[PDB]
Amino acid sequence: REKHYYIGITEAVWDYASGSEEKELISVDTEQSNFYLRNGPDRIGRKYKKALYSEYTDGTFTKTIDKPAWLGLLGPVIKAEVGDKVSVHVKNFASRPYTFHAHGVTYTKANEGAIYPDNTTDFQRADDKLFPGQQYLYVLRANEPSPGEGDSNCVTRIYHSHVDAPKDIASGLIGPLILCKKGSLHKEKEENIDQEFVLMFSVVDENLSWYLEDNIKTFCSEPEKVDKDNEDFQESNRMYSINGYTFGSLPGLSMCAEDRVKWYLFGMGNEVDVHSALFHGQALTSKNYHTDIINLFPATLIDVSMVAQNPGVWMLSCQNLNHLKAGLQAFFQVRDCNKPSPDDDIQDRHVRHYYIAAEETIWDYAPSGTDTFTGENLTSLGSDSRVFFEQGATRIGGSYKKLVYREYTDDSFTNRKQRGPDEEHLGILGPVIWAEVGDIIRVTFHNKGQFPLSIQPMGVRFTKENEGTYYGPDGRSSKQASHVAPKETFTYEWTVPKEMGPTYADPVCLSKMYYSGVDLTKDIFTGLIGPMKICKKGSLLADGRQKDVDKEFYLFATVFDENESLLLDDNIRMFTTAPENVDKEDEDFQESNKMHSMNGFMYGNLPGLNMCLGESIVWYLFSAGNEADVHGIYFSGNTYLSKGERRDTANLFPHKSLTLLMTPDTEGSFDVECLTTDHYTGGMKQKYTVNQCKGQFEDVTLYQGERTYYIAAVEVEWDYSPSRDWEMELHHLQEQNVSNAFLDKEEFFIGSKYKKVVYREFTDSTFREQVKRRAEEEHLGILGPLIHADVGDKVKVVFKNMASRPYSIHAHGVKTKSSTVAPTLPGEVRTYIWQIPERSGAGTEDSPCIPWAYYSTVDRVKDLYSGLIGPLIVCRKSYVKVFNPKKKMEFSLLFLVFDENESWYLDDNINTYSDHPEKVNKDNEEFIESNKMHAINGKMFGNLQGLTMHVGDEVNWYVMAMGNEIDLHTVHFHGHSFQYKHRGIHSSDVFDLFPGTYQTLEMFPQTPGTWLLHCHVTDHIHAGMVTTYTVLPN
């Protein structure tokens, strides 16, 4: 079915906050909104000149088709069904060159609308740059896997300009393309769906817009003291918005109770774009799983479905606490249209009544005064721990006055419900609030602190009179529920209707949470946080434990920002010997109050994660905070299942929660730790213990095949950019000069070459011949050799350390005989034995082959960054049936900012490479930045080669991330979409990666060309995390 859209690009002034306040917002005052919104001498305000896409009736562009009010600054909605040919007539009426570039969809090289080194010429680069007054017809076909069999009828894709994509997007050229299964549309709207909304969550950065200078000229009434480097000024140009509406100003999100709604969501921007969308008071699903928070990163694409309930005005907010207080909030309205309630139904409903007080403790984040992993004193000189535990003149130390939720037996708040051995691990968390689907939950909350507080659940149903957070206008008079003053008591009633419970496909119990909502951005960090567990009807025993489960554990990961605590002033007075001298604004004082922790515990002090070999364990993980809260919680020694996928590292973000199923199969003391580099260093690491508890057999676990690999750690000179031709050509084509902070030696920087240590394969146990890398492995770059294994194998890794200090080799996923990994000393060879049982391979919904990172354990952080990293691929044991071949291609991609500041080889590289090493200050911020190498397989700006395939190939891409808080990587392939999970049931062209995320993506190349492959985060594209792959004709 052939379709036509006419879309025009025009400059026009956008108003980020048409609506004012008026509005009563979560955790925002006049000051905070003025910061971003108010015009001044040095400040632009809320109106910016932007370039926007608009829809026209005709190839003449003589009249507009009106955008829906809620679309805001997004371009008009394009819809396509599988098999449609879509012609997008685009004309540019702005003052600089621009394009139209589509994600969901198949285009030839002449129809891509993106400029980069691709060996194309003339008849083919006309799409890539549309000057002022130029016009182009973009021919798109909905011919990839499009939406998968496990995807919704309609899914979210995007389009945007791609001259310099990040700057063009920031300028305002972004819109939605909704891609649907044949033929789910009627009159351009999905059948049996009452409402379709599209929302972009973005920190729209007007410092990056092309129109920044134009906007300084127009709105700054004195264009003098404005240093554009000024941090406070840059920040005032960051508009924390949905569809370009800030501070509750998004209009037109209305619907009726019982409406079947689709929300098409995406994130856009840079590293600060860690979003956590909450639709307050509503019940959401995605891919037939219950969702409570929707996380969105740059170019994250997702769609969710909901049936609107509970007539009223409801908040849509980002729960990234930094974003929330910068105005990222909107309202939507659910009207009572007298549509019929499917009035249910439920028998033997129970009341779960809890008695909970907020009260003061002195919370010690590490009672032993040591890092339990190393035995070291936390305040020992030169240690990383000392930053946080040092106590003296302007330094609080390891113990803080906190406010904490605590369970009592009754309404007199006299006798604690004492915390069992099962609940010792809870630590700082309040008691678990649990319920089954159908139940009523009552919570009698008594405030014994000096600040007003509340209880706000995430993921149960409350009437407006029971809501824990205040905002409006939404027709509420009484503040009682949202403001429980210092000696008052309030009894909350919430309910648990089935839409708020697990779906068919979900686990038995969902992890959720509750917290104080009087001021969310301070209260949680004050300590007012606890777990909630919501379960299928009939699944719990009388005490709340799940039926076929031996133990249940709750892990809350966060950077506890004591600077944000309500009690920061009491603590300054109580704990510093010189409170008058404390400057709260000092960066180093701030850092010292950031306690990187798990349940309030740090550096191995978390007690009570103890269990027996073979027991059935459920882990409920969750987090809260801001963009610093990107967590990869790694359980060494065991894997878990979740939604039929096997992993050993769970990614968390603000307000995210997960349920993981584990049956531990080896005795010992293991690490549960955050892999995120800064967090591990900062103390976010703990022990869990698996004990025998009886006996009994000597030797019973799975080995059949044996494979042996000879691998060494070799010191090597590594070049992140051995050519600069790709980079320079990209820039010629964009018409931009621009310097490079990472590669330009300047006066005294290192450049692109660094001494690193890397894993390399050898032919036998003599280690006299390095394996010569084939053409199909050229792409590996810094990665170690592919280690392949089948379920049931034993893998012998014979490891030689040919480098200058101790290192090791260990894999995620894999089973070993003990919890300790032996170091290999320089010149020593050591055999490591990796068992590959069923639990180290695909879960029932994984593709047949799954990737696991292997890495060194001696110093997790510094060994990674020094260069030791590689892919272990584990495949399901080969079926007995197969008659003929197929022709399978494998590529492994590692998205990582190599921080050469943390390399063991930094001093050698200072002395070897800078023209004047005397001049080098390691604490200088510009030098630090020069050594952050933003790469794919340790190569930048198109130097990653060997990604070559043919039309009709079957390709597995094994994508991986590791690293720091900042290593959020959203992997986008131009020219093809991919699929994942068993049988390629899900489809996309952006895959979200974080430290410890590993995934098989299947691709079926069909359009020839040379295609861009890049992370979609602004900072990372600009810094070089980009290459191409080439699809040749059959």
Ligand SMILES: *[C@@H]1O[C@H](CO)[C@@H](O)[C@H](O)[C@H]1NC(C)=O
């Ligand atoms: C750590 O070191 C200091 C000595 O500067 C000492 O006062 C402190 O008690 C030590 N603590 C532990 C738990 O070893």
Ligand SMILES: [Ca+2]
């Ligand atoms: Ca082109």
Ligand SMILES: [Cu+2]
């Ligand atoms: Cu894109």
Ligand SMILES: [Cu+2]
């Ligand atoms: Cu956000």
Ligand SMILES: [Cu+2]
């Ligand atoms: Cu929920």
Ligand SMILES: [Cu+2]
């Ligand atoms: Cu973390």
Ligand SMILES: [Cu+2]
């Ligand atoms: Cu940190």
Ligand SMILES: [Cu+2]
């Ligand atoms: Cu990235």
Ligand SMILES: [Cu+2]
């Ligand atoms: Cu693209």
Ligand SMILES: [Cu+2]
């Ligand atoms: Cu791109």
Ligand SMILES: [Cu+2]
């Ligand atoms: Cu960067």
Ligand code: NA
């Ligand atoms: Na200015």
Ligand code: NA
């Ligand atoms: Na502003």
